[PDB]
Structure 1
Amino acid sequence: YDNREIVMKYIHYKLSQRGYEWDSEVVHLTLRQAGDDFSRRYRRDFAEMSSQLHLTPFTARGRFATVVEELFRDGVNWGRIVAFFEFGGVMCVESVNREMSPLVDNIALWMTEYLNRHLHTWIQDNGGWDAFVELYGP
């Protein structure tokens, strides 16, 4: 699947939920629902994430890199991948909320690059997005 597309569609959805309009199908829908489910379950972790970002134009890239290293420190699995998308979502929402919308394109780029460089192999070795969909889709 095309990672850039997966990222852009995810980001658009998270921003829309917060009242912002930003400018294979079963994969996007399944990922969406798992992300909503993640943020519902880990309610406090989700709620508290935005307040720990301290975004600035020059630190955002490093904040992203720091949280993502921690997230995947013990290895990759589908749950952590969903949390990774949810984290990117929180970053984008916080960016737009703090009048730093130009960060959104950058974040989308960092997510895409992390997918391509660091998650692609695990994903292919574990059945691809099709296997994700089989586990957590309807």
Structure 2
Amino acid sequence: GSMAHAGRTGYDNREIVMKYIHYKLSQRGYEWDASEVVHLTLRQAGDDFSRRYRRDFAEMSSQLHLTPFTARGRFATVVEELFRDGVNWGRIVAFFEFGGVMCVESVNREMSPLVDNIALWMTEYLNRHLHTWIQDNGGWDAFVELYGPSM
């Protein structure tokens, strides 16, 4: 199967989101369950993103103020502004990291059911607003080629 892009359907994007969230929560010791080189590369890119982010800025969760009623709008506002003037792989990694932070904060704030919702919101946003761009810019394959090297 070398003729088409890796993870080229919404079903694959869903799997990518669920595995990402499981990883980000596992880094905190929180167990949760709802292309392999793709999952691996995204783990690495998000971790390296976070390292850099934290060198410059305070904890991402400091800015959130989650409640069950407002979490969806909070997510939508941030992600809309992130992509308002365009998409690139760096912004996509930022999107995954933001989603991860939202999930971690939900669990910290004893709102663990929100994790399942956030997973849904990320999957829908990916499929509605990023997937076209991903296919048009080389698939997850291009991401693996660009972000594969560990620096």
| TM norm structure 1 | 0.96
Q: Where is the helix percentage greater, Structure 1 or Structure 2?
A: 1
**Compared CA separation, residues 46 and 105, structure 1 to 2 (3 A):** farther
Deviation sequence 1:53-109 (CA, Å, 0-9, x none): 110010000000011111112200000000000000000000001000000000000
Q: What corresponds to 1:132 in structure 2? A: 143
**Separation of aligned partners in 2, 1:116 and 1:15:** 23
Cα RMSD after superposing both structures: 1.3
**Separation of aligned partners in 1, 2:87 and 2:61:** 23
**Compared CA separation, residues 35 and 92, structure 1 to 2 (3 A):** same
Task: Return 121-130 or 18-27, whichever deviates more.
Answer: 18-27
Deviation at 1:51, TM superposition (A): 1.3
**Compared CA separation, residues 45 and 74, structure 1 to 2 (3 A):** farther
Structure whose CA Rg is larger: 2
**Separation of aligned partners in 1, 2:56 and 2:116:** 25
Contact 1:39 1:46 in 2 (8 A): no
How many residues of Structure 1 are paired with residues of Structure 2 in the alignment?
Answer: 138
Q: Unpaired runs of 5+ in structure 2?
A: 1-10
- Structure 1 residue corresponding to 2:44, chosen from 8, 11, 33: 33
Q: Unpaired runs of 5+ in structure 1?
A: none
**Separation of aligned partners in 1, 2:76 and 2:60:** 15
Give the fraction of aligned pairs with identical amino acids, expressed as a percent.
100
